Design a protein around this motif. Sequence first.
Motif, PDB file in Angstrom:
ATOM      1  N   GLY A 397      48.897 -71.319  54.248  1.00  0.00           N
ATOM      2  CA  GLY A 397      49.715 -70.689  55.272  1.00  0.00           C
ATOM      3  C   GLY A 397      49.002 -70.519  56.594  1.00  0.00           C
ATOM      4  N   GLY A 398      48.199 -71.506  56.986  1.00  0.00           N
ATOM      5  CA  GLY A 398      47.507 -71.444  58.262  1.00  0.00           C
ATOM      6  C   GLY A 398      46.560 -70.273  58.390  1.00  0.00           C
ATOM      7  N   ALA A 399      45.925 -69.866  57.288  1.00  0.00           N
ATOM      8  CA  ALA A 399      44.989 -68.749  57.346  1.00  0.00           C
ATOM      9  C   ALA A 399      43.786 -69.067  58.220  1.00  0.00           C
ATOM     10  CB  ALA A 399      44.534 -68.372  55.936  1.00  0.00           C
ATOM     11  N   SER A 400      43.371 -70.335  58.266  1.00  0.00           N
ATOM     12  CA  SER A 400      42.284 -70.719  59.160  1.00  0.00           C
ATOM     13  C   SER A 400      42.654 -70.463  60.616  1.00  0.00           C
ATOM     14  CB  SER A 400      41.925 -72.190  58.948  1.00  0.00           C
ATOM     15  N   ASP A 401      43.900 -70.762  60.992  1.00  0.00           N
ATOM     16  CA  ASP A 401      44.332 -70.536  62.367  1.00  0.00           C
ATOM     17  C   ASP A 401      44.254 -69.062  62.738  1.00  0.00           C
ATOM     18  OD1 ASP A 401      44.775 -73.195  62.973  1.00  0.00           O
ATOM     19  OD2 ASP A 401      46.869 -73.147  62.317  1.00  0.00           O
ATOM     20  N   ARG A 402      44.703 -68.176  61.844  1.00  0.00           N
ATOM     21  CA  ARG A 402      44.625 -66.753  62.151  1.00  0.00           C
ATOM     22  C   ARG A 402      43.179 -66.294  62.249  1.00  0.00           C
ATOM     23  NH1 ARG A 402      48.952 -66.862  58.056  1.00  0.00           N
ATOM     24  NH2 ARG A 402      47.248 -66.546  56.560  1.00  0.00           N
ATOM     25  N   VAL A 403      42.291 -66.870  61.437  1.00  0.00           N
ATOM     26  CA  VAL A 403      40.874 -66.528  61.519  1.00  0.00           C
ATOM     27  C   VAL A 403      40.317 -66.932  62.877  1.00  0.00           C
ATOM     28  CG1 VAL A 403      38.602 -67.152  60.635  1.00  0.00           C
ATOM     29  CG2 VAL A 403      40.442 -66.536  59.053  1.00  0.00           C
ATOM     30  N   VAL A 404      40.654 -68.145  63.325  1.00  0.00           N
ATOM     31  CA  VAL A 404      40.154 -68.623  64.610  1.00  0.00           C
ATOM     32  C   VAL A 404      40.694 -67.758  65.739  1.00  0.00           C
ATOM     33  CG1 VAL A 404      40.154 -70.565  66.208  1.00  0.00           C
ATOM     34  CG2 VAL A 404      39.813 -70.964  63.768  1.00  0.00           C
ATOM     35  N   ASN A 405      41.953 -67.327  65.626  1.00  0.00           N
ATOM     36  CA  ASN A 405      42.531 -66.465  66.653  1.00  0.00           C
ATOM     37  C   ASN A 405      41.857 -65.099  66.672  1.00  0.00           C
ATOM     38  OD1 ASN A 405      44.261 -68.437  67.508  1.00  0.00           O
ATOM     39  ND2 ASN A 405      46.103 -67.560  66.571  1.00  0.00           N
ATOM     40  N   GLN A 406      41.563 -64.547  65.492  1.00  0.00           N
ATOM     41  CA  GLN A 406      40.855 -63.275  65.424  1.00  0.00           C
ATOM     42  C   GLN A 406      39.476 -63.389  66.054  1.00  0.00           C
ATOM     43  OE1 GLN A 406      41.463 -59.564  63.653  1.00  0.00           O
ATOM     44  NE2 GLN A 406      40.673 -60.123  65.678  1.00  0.00           N
ATOM     45  N   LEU A 407      38.760 -64.479  65.764  1.00  0.00           N
ATOM     46  CA  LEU A 407      37.449 -64.688  66.375  1.00  0.00           C
ATOM     47  C   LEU A 407      37.570 -64.791  67.889  1.00  0.00           C
ATOM     48  CD1 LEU A 407      35.248 -64.778  64.227  1.00  0.00           C
ATOM     49  CD2 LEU A 407      34.953 -67.213  64.691  1.00  0.00           C
ATOM     50  N   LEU A 408      38.553 -65.564  68.359  1.00  0.00           N
ATOM     51  CA  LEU A 408      38.768 -65.719  69.791  1.00  0.00           C
ATOM     52  C   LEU A 408      38.986 -64.372  70.461  1.00  0.00           C
ATOM     53  CD1 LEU A 408      41.045 -68.877  69.747  1.00  0.00           C
ATOM     54  CD2 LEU A 408      38.925 -68.661  71.031  1.00  0.00           C
ATOM     55  N   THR A 409      39.861 -63.542  69.888  1.00  0.00           N
ATOM     56  CA  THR A 409      40.117 -62.250  70.515  1.00  0.00           C
ATOM     57  C   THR A 409      38.914 -61.326  70.408  1.00  0.00           C
ATOM     58  OG1 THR A 409      41.088 -61.375  68.480  1.00  0.00           O
ATOM     59  CG2 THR A 409      42.563 -62.443  70.045  1.00  0.00           C
ATOM     60  N   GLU A 410      38.115 -61.463  69.349  1.00  0.00           N
ATOM     61  CA  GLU A 410      37.014 -60.528  69.166  1.00  0.00           C
ATOM     62  C   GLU A 410      35.852 -60.838  70.101  1.00  0.00           C
ATOM     63  OE1 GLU A 410      35.870 -57.654  67.215  1.00  0.00           O
ATOM     64  OE2 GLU A 410      37.998 -57.388  67.657  1.00  0.00           O
ATOM     65  N   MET A 411      35.593 -62.121  70.363  1.00  0.00           N
ATOM     66  CA  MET A 411      34.503 -62.471  71.266  1.00  0.00           C
ATOM     67  C   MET A 411      34.876 -62.305  72.733  1.00  0.00           C
ATOM     68  SD  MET A 411      33.828 -65.521  68.767  1.00  0.00           S
ATOM     69  CE  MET A 411      33.529 -66.817  69.964  1.00  0.00           C
ATOM     70  N   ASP A 412      36.170 -62.254  73.051  1.00  0.00           N
ATOM     71  CA  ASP A 412      36.606 -62.048  74.430  1.00  0.00           C
ATOM     72  C   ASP A 412      38.033 -61.520  74.376  1.00  0.00           C
ATOM     73  OD1 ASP A 412      37.182 -62.020  77.107  1.00  0.00           O
ATOM     74  OD2 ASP A 412      36.723 -64.133  77.466  1.00  0.00           O
ATOM     75  N   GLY A 413      38.208 -60.241  74.693  1.00  0.00           N
ATOM     76  CA  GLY A 413      39.521 -59.629  74.682  1.00  0.00           C
ATOM     77  C   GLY A 413      39.542 -58.300  75.406  1.00  0.00           C
ATOM     78  N   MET A 414      40.285 -57.338  74.869  1.00  0.00           N
ATOM     79  CA  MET A 414      40.384 -56.010  75.470  1.00  0.00           C
ATOM     80  C   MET A 414      39.294 -55.091  74.931  1.00  0.00           C
ATOM     81  SD  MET A 414      43.335 -57.489  76.563  1.00  0.00           S
ATOM     82  CE  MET A 414      43.204 -58.225  74.935  1.00  0.00           C
ATOM     83  N   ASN A 415      38.049 -55.545  75.049  1.00  0.00           N
ATOM     84  CA  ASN A 415      36.885 -54.834  74.550  1.00  0.00           C
ATOM     85  C   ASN A 415      35.924 -54.542  75.693  1.00  0.00           C
ATOM     86  OD1 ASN A 415      36.338 -57.526  74.925  1.00  0.00           O
ATOM     87  ND2 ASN A 415      35.015 -57.740  73.124  1.00  0.00           N
ATOM     88  N   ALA A 416      35.093 -53.514  75.497  1.00  0.00           N
ATOM     89  CA  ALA A 416      34.127 -53.151  76.528  1.00  0.00           C
ATOM     90  C   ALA A 416      33.046 -54.213  76.677  1.00  0.00           C
ATOM     91  CB  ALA A 416      33.503 -51.793  76.210  1.00  0.00           C
ATOM     92  N   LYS A 417      32.695 -54.897  75.584  1.00  0.00           N
ATOM     93  CA  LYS A 417      31.745 -56.010  75.613  1.00  0.00           C
ATOM     94  C   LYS A 417      30.391 -55.573  76.170  1.00  0.00           C
ATOM     95  N   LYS A 418      29.818 -54.534  75.565  1.00  0.00           N
ATOM     96  CA  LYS A 418      28.549 -54.008  76.050  1.00  0.00           C
ATOM     97  C   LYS A 418      27.403 -54.999  75.835  1.00  0.00           C
ATOM     98  CE  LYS A 418      29.356 -50.440  73.494  1.00  0.00           C
ATOM     99  NZ  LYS A 418      30.370 -51.003  72.562  1.00  0.00           N
ATOM    100  N   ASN A 419      27.013 -55.268  74.587  1.00  0.00           N
ATOM    101  CA  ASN A 419      25.889 -56.171  74.311  1.00  0.00           C
ATOM    102  C   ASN A 419      26.069 -56.743  72.900  1.00  0.00           C
ATOM    103  OD1 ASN A 419      24.384 -56.249  76.695  1.00  0.00           O
ATOM    104  ND2 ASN A 419      23.215 -54.413  76.155  1.00  0.00           N
ATOM    105  N   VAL A 420      26.702 -57.911  72.820  1.00  0.00           N
ATOM    106  CA  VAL A 420      26.789 -58.671  71.579  1.00  0.00           C
ATOM    107  C   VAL A 420      26.436 -60.117  71.893  1.00  0.00           C
ATOM    108  CG1 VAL A 420      28.246 -59.442  69.688  1.00  0.00           C
ATOM    109  CG2 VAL A 420      28.535 -57.142  70.612  1.00  0.00           C
TER     110      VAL A 420
END
Lengths: 489, 548, 139, 139, 22
Positions: A397-420
């Motif tokens: 059921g396209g679980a890989s696609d949702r994983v890639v989307n989660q990674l995309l949003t987590e590395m650059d999204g509505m986050n403070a992005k202090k130091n990762v």
Amino acid sequence: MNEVGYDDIGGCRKQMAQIREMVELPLRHPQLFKAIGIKPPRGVLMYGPPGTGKTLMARAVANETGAFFFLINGPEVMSKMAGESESNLRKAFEEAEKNAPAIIFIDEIDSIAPKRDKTNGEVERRVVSQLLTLMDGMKARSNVVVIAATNRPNSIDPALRRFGRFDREVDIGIPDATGRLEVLRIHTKNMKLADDVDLEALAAETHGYVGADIASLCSEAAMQQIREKMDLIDLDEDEIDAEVLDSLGVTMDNFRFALGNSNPSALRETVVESVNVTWDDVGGLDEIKEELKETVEYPVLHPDQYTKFGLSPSKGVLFYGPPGTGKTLLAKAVATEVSANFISVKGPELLSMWYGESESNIRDIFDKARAAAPTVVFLDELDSIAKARGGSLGDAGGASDRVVNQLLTEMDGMNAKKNVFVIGATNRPDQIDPAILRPGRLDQLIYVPLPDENARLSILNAQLRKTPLEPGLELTAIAKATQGFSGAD
Amino acid sequence: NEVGYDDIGGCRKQMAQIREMVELPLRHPQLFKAIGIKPPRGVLMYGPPGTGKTLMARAVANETGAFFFLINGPEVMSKMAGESESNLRKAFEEAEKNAPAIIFIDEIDSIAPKRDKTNGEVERRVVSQLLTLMDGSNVVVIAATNRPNSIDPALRRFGRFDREVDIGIPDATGRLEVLRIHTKNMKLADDVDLEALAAETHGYVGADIASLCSEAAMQQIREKMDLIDLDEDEIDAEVLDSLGVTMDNFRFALGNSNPSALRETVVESVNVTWDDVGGLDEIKEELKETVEYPVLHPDQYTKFGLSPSKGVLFYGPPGTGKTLLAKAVATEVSANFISVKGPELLSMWYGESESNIRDIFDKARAAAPTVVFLDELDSIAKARGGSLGDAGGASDRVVNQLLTEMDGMNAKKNVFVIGATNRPDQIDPAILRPGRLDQLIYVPLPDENARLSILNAQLRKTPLEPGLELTAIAKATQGFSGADLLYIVQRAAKYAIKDSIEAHRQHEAEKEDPVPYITKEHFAEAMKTAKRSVSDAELRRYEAYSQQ
Amino acid sequence: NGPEVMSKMAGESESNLRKAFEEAEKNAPAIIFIDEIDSIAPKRDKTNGEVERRVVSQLLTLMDGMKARSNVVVIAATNRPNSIDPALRRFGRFDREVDIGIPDATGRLEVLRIHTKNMKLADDVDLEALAAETHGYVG
Amino acid sequence: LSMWYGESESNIRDIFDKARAAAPTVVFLDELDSIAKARGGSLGDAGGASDRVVNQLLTEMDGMNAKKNVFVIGATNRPDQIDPAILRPGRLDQLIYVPLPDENARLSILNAQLRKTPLEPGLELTAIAKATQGFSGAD
Amino acid sequence: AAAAAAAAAAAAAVAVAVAVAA
Ligand SMILES: [Mg+2]
Ligand SMILES: [Mg+2]
Ligand SMILES: [Mg+2]
Ligand SMILES: [Mg+2]
């Protein structure tokens, strides 16, 4: 004297001022609050990471303030008989109100106050409604303020999070370097220290430590010092000589030893087995070593320079090349040498059979990474979870696609992005999605080429650094003879 | 003094209805019999928490001299066997025997749950006990629950709790009325315009206005705690009378506080401005115009007689500013904002996902007007038919839940849905139809002027060498994106920092502001390792999608 | 013992824990050993029932709260530590995690000497070869 | 649809009981591609919950005699995902196809949509209709 | 006197499977 005072807590000053305001000012200068008609807030919610110091703040308020103080542990109120829990809450509130102007403290409110919509046990919903009425309603509250402590504020009924019941939400969060310095000075104010000790370096080198972690650090240092002199005098139960009882002197070396053992309590579950490797173990590839060390060490050691320009640092890197060129070795070297925390992640480790738990796992790991920052996250074989979004129609059921989307949003999204700092290592860079290789996610694409003659010589010297050798042996011939070889061969 | 009826605001029709129901059949019983009617048995009050229910109950208790009898819901139970029913019976008996009294039952849902789908036995006994007694004159009961759907439907029927009153969230005029009510006993100095404060306060309901007022007052109190060096030894005299809340206090409090309903979904403040988003001028202008009209002057739409579109979709290549535009909207739109990440809501259990979708859309509608930013729609709204894999049918179910909560949107509450995906091929064709996300904004690769504006917007807050010609960087750069320009400026910053550190170490070595600005050589060296983020095939695909 | 505290009755598990800790503190400087803590200390977020959440909260309050403790030590044993509430894995509650792992050759020899001190062996048996050939034996 | 066990079918059951009570009624089922999902599409499922819902609907729709004269309206965007068992005639027979409007239909739609519109007097919609040809009503 | 007993039995979860297309 042993009783904790306000001077016995540090690292959080804004929140301290806010709580001192709410608890003291309406009970020290009431006329000032009578001047303007509006009444002060009479409910506050403390929330934050587990070992941040909330209960310490409650204890400090109880010890310092001269007003009456009543304590309610979370599950303590409930009882077996049908109509006794609500009776207990009513009796508690009546006792608090009748006696004097007082501060109630409800410890671990998340146990008493579920969502009242997802819960199914009746008694819970009646205790929640009883709390709602007692805290606010007809003849709401005369001169009684309520403090609550929780670790997951989102598990509270929204009716409690409204003005009149819990007016202001203070966040007792992770300290900063100055905060850790203040905490260290607080916890080492009575212990016996050697003159060599330098607390500033310790506060700088401790990264992501919160509250109790510092206490653990000092305790461990003390334990090492005790295990340095107990070997001298032992099993003398009746008495211990005053020459060793005095002049203990926990050295700075003890603190270094205790700091090397411990790690931030948040990352307790995700600790990596210590695989010691040094920079001298990595032969050749000096320029890549320099770029990596500069890209990791500058934001964490020179924050002032970045602020002076007011530009954010780059926080990504992707190694790609033939197998065995030294990618995982570089990651190991970073893990062992760099001061920042390390999160070692395998390729397919984060996948799970159920629906949505893969992305839940990704969110938890990135939550830990953002908690104990500055941190380094190593994604080994990035091609396992981050594949091109081809649809995966013939998949789960396209679980890989949702994983890639989660990674995309987590590395650059509505986050403070202090130091990762994300480090990628793939031997097939064509299968990686183009939406991750753009800057702002993985900014530097570093190619790790096949070693040259001087790089093969450097590798050979690096790999024989702990081996006895023949005096006349000239490794130059071996380097001259291997043309296309790699480090592994 | 006791809360009089004037103390309530923002509800005219509801308060008038309650007055009619409670006063006339109790102040004139003979006239009702002459007309030939009888008073109703009870009245229910519902609505979101912190709206004025308990306020209404105390106001009714004060205005009418009729005897009052409070029974809080969870206060009717007892450990003794069956003494709860006797307590409730004695409560009604005393309320009737004493006088033509009035009874107010608070939080009835705690002692009036759906009789089915329950486990206890005393709960059923008390529910039936109250049902039969109140099923059996000149006395009325008022029930006030925060959640109305968790009531035994047997009570929702003619003859028992028949008149409901939807105590809702206020409007702008009602919110202004509440502001005036709370600010009456306060020193407002001489510079204050509550009309603007109410026009800008969007989602607050009832108590939240009080929170705003209290916070503003606190800010003012903070201003005079140390600036005068107030003596903590004993109270000062003249400073106390010189207290006046200014406009900056209220603006400060407004910038901190958020509506109680959205308290769970509070997003950490990320500073962005509309001048920070270089380029894309027409896109920002159009978005501002489309989002500002329904909230600033809807009367024009009413005259036109056509409702505005409440959706928009950003699509384009990665690293162009979709999330940047959404963040800027979140910062400077003067409306509520709920951010969601694609696979944020999904859960292993059956149904919970759709429960989350309904909860979020309910929160969006409650704190109206609101702007829910759905980023990376390729996770929750991918191709329904394309998803051949049968993960138990959850994906189709979530897509249908999203459609029913997005297509079942009335003109009221003005909820604007922004979608943003880098792959427009994956979204279901049902979504990309008018009525849900009619407008389709495309964010193309920057042009020369757009690229120059982007660069000037990125390093605006960065001291640089005066004789620097950004136009050169823009020239000879064709396929780049905003992220690539960010990478270039970050490389220049890194080279400058390296030079700073080297110079400082050398200066310290000799001893035992070398670089106040970025030199042109730093930019020259940063450009040696600059590459285009997006290849040509992606551009071909996006052009094909645009032309289709 | 681990699941010894759970009761069908509502609000009784925490009563048992409170009584246990009160008894432990009322007597002397005591030690509390809680065996198999994984059954009464889950993650508090993956669980759904209320009694486990409530018992975990009671335990957390008991181990570290106002009037925390006075010369009493808590020892725990577990076969999988990662499935434990993070709020318990911090200084003050569980200061240090000891790793009792598989012995090496010397450890296996020590165990063999320990377990064969009451048997009547023959003169032809040596234990060094036995400790060598046994590799993955957990003791 | 609900997470707990059994409750789901009870919700479909009480709604249809309410429908039977207030006869005549019109139960509008929007988006049947969520309820009437292809029976047993794949072994991988939540737990035959879609199948239980479909069986509850089948047993509760076949018990419609002449009395109570109820009428169920279905409406889907994708007719391919509707179960054939429920589309069989005698259970759910009528199949209306609503095509995209033509030029005259589009003009009628536009005139019906611009009823409450103070348009400029010197304006006619016939040109737009004649030009807009493949434009749907939503367009 | 009466008494209130608590009970929490179970719930329903959803799995995800992988298929192969010839
Ligand atoms: Mg605490
Ligand atoms: Mg490798
Ligand atoms: Mg109320
Ligand atoms: Mg973006």
